[PDB]
Amino acid sequence: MMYKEPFGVKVDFETGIIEGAKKSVRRLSDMEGYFVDERAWKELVEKEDPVVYEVYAVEQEEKEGDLNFATTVLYPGKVGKEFFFTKGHFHAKLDRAEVYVALKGKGGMLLQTPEGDAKWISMEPGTVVYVPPYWAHRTVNIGDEPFIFLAIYPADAGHDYGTIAEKGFSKIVIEENGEVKVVDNPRWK
Amino acid sequence: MMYKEPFGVKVDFETGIIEGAKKSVRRLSDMEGYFVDERAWKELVEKEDPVVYEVYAVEQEEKEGDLNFATTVLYPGKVGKEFFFTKGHFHAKLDRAEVYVALKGKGGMLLQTPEGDAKWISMEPGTVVYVPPYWAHRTVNIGDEPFIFLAIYPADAGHDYGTIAEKGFSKIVIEENGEVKVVDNPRWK
Questions:
Q1: Cα dist. A155→A31, A79, B111 in Å?
Q2: CB A98 within 8 A of CB A136
Q3: Under a CB-based contact definition with an 8 Å cutoff, are residues A83 and A175 in contact?
Q4: In this structure, what DSSP letter does residue B46 have?
Q5: Cβ count near B24 (within 10 Å)
Q6: How, per the record, is this protein's activity regulated (chains A, B)?
Q7: How far is CA A161 from the centre of its chain?
Q8: For chain A, what is the domain count?
Q9: CB B109 within 8 A of CB B138
Q10: B21 touching chain A per CB within 8 A
Q11: For FRET with A185, which of A66, A105, B130, B182 sits at 20 to 30 Å CA-CA?
């Protein structure tokens, strides 16, 4: 049979860049509906429209058994009181796991079951997080430097319904009085 | 529903040690039959019998779509002219990818299809390697310090060590006149 060609690629742990990867940039204007304080979001778009995160994906063709990987630079910031985050993956094939790996910065992972029972895991350099089957997840930057991480998902997991852009997550992550706080999301029904 | 608990663990990128992950120690005496030079293997066993490599492993119950992960401290050394390696596996379920991430040290990967065609990939820090479906593989240390790395594989890939001592890999990796060389395995048939 014709076997796939194996390869090695370099990754900078200080910049998350992979040479040759499929780059993708998400600005704040690409995240309408996602943050709670919708007016802060408007003010911050017109006046800067900052970069929220960069992804560097190395994805295969979507077969059972095969693996994709991805680095993300998630930049620091706030939209109101709420911390910058990724859009949030919820899988098409639900019982896939994912392994995330912290490379540089301070952050964490917001997780939730389909019904919205929530879990928060802190992430410093070196922390490897196992996302189990059936869990949604989104990564948040809770520090002052870019949070960079490597992600390893199955090729056949996908991203769709259970949508985050209209529905979202049971809890949000915010800064109250210097301190980090996982609290309830008022927009979650 | 019954859902699995997500978690974080802490991986030291300077030492390989995952906290509370449970070690496997393979000392030279556990790799009988693996290195071309059987007689240098006996000699080096009698005298010292060192730990060739350690594995700190976080596994799930094997279940299509779940992932394990594990670091390896592959210690440095040689058996005659041939550098120290992992025993290396074909998977029990063959069409399964892995992804490796090199953390410290200097090394490489040896890879091979069921029919024998080899492939060598340099690994230094930053090197992520995609091990595609249907390939066996073995990690090799080629410098004077430990080669430490992380691996993420499908939880149900299983473990075929049998084809690899019995038959071998088609190519071995040795030091010859100071420079690292990848050559044919005299054992190979």
A1: 25, 32, 21
A2: no
A3: yes
A4: H
A5: 12
A6: Inhibited by mannose 6-phosphate, fructose 1-phosphate and fructose 1,6-bisphosphate.
A7: 17
A8: 1
A9: yes
A10: no
A11: A105
Which of B130, B137, B140, B150 to probe the A interface (max A CBs under 10 A)?
B130
Chain B nearest-CA distance from A163, in A, is 20
What CATH number is associated with residue A183? 2.60.120.10
Identity at B134, one-letter amino acid code: Y
CA-based nearest residue in chain B for residue A94: B65
Which residues are A9's β-sheet partners? B128
Q: What is the number of residues in chain B?
A: 189
Check whether A137 is labelled as a binding-site residue.
Answer: yes
Q: How many CB pairs under 8 A join A and B?
A: 156
Instruction: Tell me which DSSP letter residue A124 carries.
Output: -
Ligand-binding annotation for A159, yes or no, is: no
**B residues 96-135 near A, CB within 8 Å?**
96-99, 101, 109, 111, 113, 119, 121-123, 125-135
B126: containing domain? 1-189
How far CA B155 is from CA of B1, B62, B67, in Å, comes to 21, 5, 5
* Size of chain A in residues: 189
- Does A18 contact chain B (CB < 8 Å)? yes
Cβ(A67)–Cβ(A155) under 8 Å? yes
Min Cα–Cα distance to chain B from A98, Å: 7
Cα separation, A65 vs A75, in Å, equals 32
Q: Is B11 an 8 Å CB contact of chain A?
A: yes
Place of tokens 């196992």: A130
d(CA A55, CA A70): 7
Four-CA torsion B112, B189, B78, B73, nearest 10 degrees: 30
Residue carrying the six token digits 């990987």: A69
Q: How many angstroms separate the CA atoms of B150 and B96, rounded?
A: 17
Query: Is B183 an interface residue toward A (CB < 8 Å)?
Result: no
Name the one residue in this structure whose structure tokens are 């299809």.
B113
Binding residues of B for Fe cation: 89, 91, 98, 137
Method of determination is X-ray
The values of phi and psi at residue B167, to 5°, are: -100, -40
User: What is the C-alpha to C-alpha distance for residues A21 and A9, in angstroms, rounded to an integer?
Assistant: 9
